[PDB]
């Protein structure tokens, strides 16, 4: 038994997922006056949720079908609301901000999770937090803010961070009190989010517009489909890595994956970055790694 693939599969899958997301959301469809921007975040998130739910169903039906799910449906619905809210808010924010900024902001999960835990759950962090978390804040203030009001994009990113913190709190509570497996939770929350997003797109009137837009630029279809696939397989790998190595291994793996994704976005796509902004990303990632190691 060899486990390099715990690194290789997750890294490749999520790296390609990030590249496809950048190519889709920030792509320059059309030209000149005919140029159009991808404003259909709901449809993208709905497709991703559908693909993830299908893969989760396959995984549970083929892997470890003996387990019985003790969780309550309403808990799954409540978690899925925040989960899909976070995903939609982040994807919509990506329309305004660059991709490096989007990923860096979405990486700062520890700050909202600590705030939620201390303010609501009352858990105290002697050394796990309050140290290497101020490092993350310093890095963000170095990158997002510079010496030389905030727009819609960072507001939406902050909202996504808050929703992600709420989702994490709910998931932790349900895991503790109902012993829910990763595959079952992933399937259920993805199904609930798929239903909610289907209702939202159908009633909002965005499905017709998205279909017309795709008809205008058919290639995007392929892209988004691949994107969805890369969001599933990699996720599955992470699940395995959760049960094979442990949580710390998964955390460090995703941290290095995010760093390499930022590097790829900066270099391949010619996203403009400058000195004293690289320092912010370095500080953020160092703080995230130290927090993962301790606590």
């Amino acid at each position, epitope marked *: 038994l060899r486990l390099p693939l715990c690194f290789l599969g997750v890294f490749v899958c999520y790296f390609y997922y990030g590249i496809l997301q950048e190519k889709i959301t920030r792509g320059k469809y059309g030209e000149g006056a005919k140029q159009e921007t991808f404003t259909f975040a709901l449809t993208l998130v709905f497709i991703q949720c559908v693909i993830n739910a299908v893969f989760a169903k396959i995984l549970i039906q083929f892997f470890d079908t*003996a387990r*019985v799910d*003790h969780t*309550r449906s309403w808990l799954y619905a409540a978690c899925s609301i925040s989960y899909l809210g976070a995903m939609v808010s982040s994807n919509s924010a990506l329309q305004f901000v660059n991709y490096p900024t989007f990923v860096l902001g979405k990486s700062c999960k520890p700050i909202p999770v600590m705030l939620l835990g201390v303010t609501l759950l009352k858990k105290k962090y002697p050394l796990a937090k309050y140290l290497c978390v101020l490092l993350i804040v310093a890095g963000v203030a170095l990158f997002m803010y510079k010496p030389k009001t905030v727009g819609y994009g960072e507001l939406l990113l902050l909202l996504s961070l808050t929703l992600d913190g709420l989702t994490g709190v709910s998931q*932790d509570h349900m*895991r*503790a*009190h*109902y*012993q829910t497996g990763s595959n079952h939770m992933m399937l259920n929350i993805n199904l609930w989010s798929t239903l909610l997003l289907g209702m939202g797109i159908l009633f909002t009137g965005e499905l017709w517009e998205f279909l017309s837009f795709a008809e205008r630029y058919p290639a995007i279809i392929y892209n988004i489909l691949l994107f969805g696939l890369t969001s599933a397989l990699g996720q599955s790998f992470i699940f395995m890595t959760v049960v094979y190595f442990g949580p710390l291994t998964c955390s460090i793996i995703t941290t290095t994956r995010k760093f390499f994704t930022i590097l790829a976005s900066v270099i391949l796509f010619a996203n403009p970055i400058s000195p004293m902004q690289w320092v912010g990303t370095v500080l953020v990632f160092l703080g995230l790694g130290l927090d993962a190691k301790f606590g």
Partner: single-chain antibody
Amino acid sequence: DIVMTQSPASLTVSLGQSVTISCRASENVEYYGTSLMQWYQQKPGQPPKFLIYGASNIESGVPARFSGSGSGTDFSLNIHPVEEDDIAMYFCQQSRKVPYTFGSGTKLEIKGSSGEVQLQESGPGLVKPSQSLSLTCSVTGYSITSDYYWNWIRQFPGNKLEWMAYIRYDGTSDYNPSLKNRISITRDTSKNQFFLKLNSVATEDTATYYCARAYYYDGINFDYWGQGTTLTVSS
């Protein structure tokens, strides 16, 4: 399956003393920081009474005297102001793995000596070996199609409990892997009953069979119990 061992077989204690009963599991019974342990109390000739879940959380209605502590593979139940009422056999149960297992039981004895759910079990008393048996548990005051687990458990002579199986209101059922090939659990919603059928009963099946209602929270907790029906297998 996890084997639960209760350290004190029988504790001779006086009134007012602080009594601690220790239970140990063959494997860690923690899951994301939650200890899946339950403590029940059984008075003589009565069904077990649910006391504690999660190893520290006192069930509503239980006196404040009782408390729980411990983690990992070692747990303890403490009663500081012991009274006459808390004289019984105490059982520790693990809900980490599907074949839920109870402790051997610790007996405590003193020196010098429509608004609720009703479960009723019925079935033959004396049965020849190799015959097929069918116990029926009828529920009144509640519907088996609402959110609760309905379990069949049996207690052998010597007070050794053994969870046989259960059926959820969704229709999903779980069985003890040891007995999975000998028992079958079914339900009839029209009459609001559920049945356990045993094939090829043997002399070792003699026991008191209870049907219980349980809810899952930090482990399965058999909060409501039936009166128990005796079954004797003899030639």
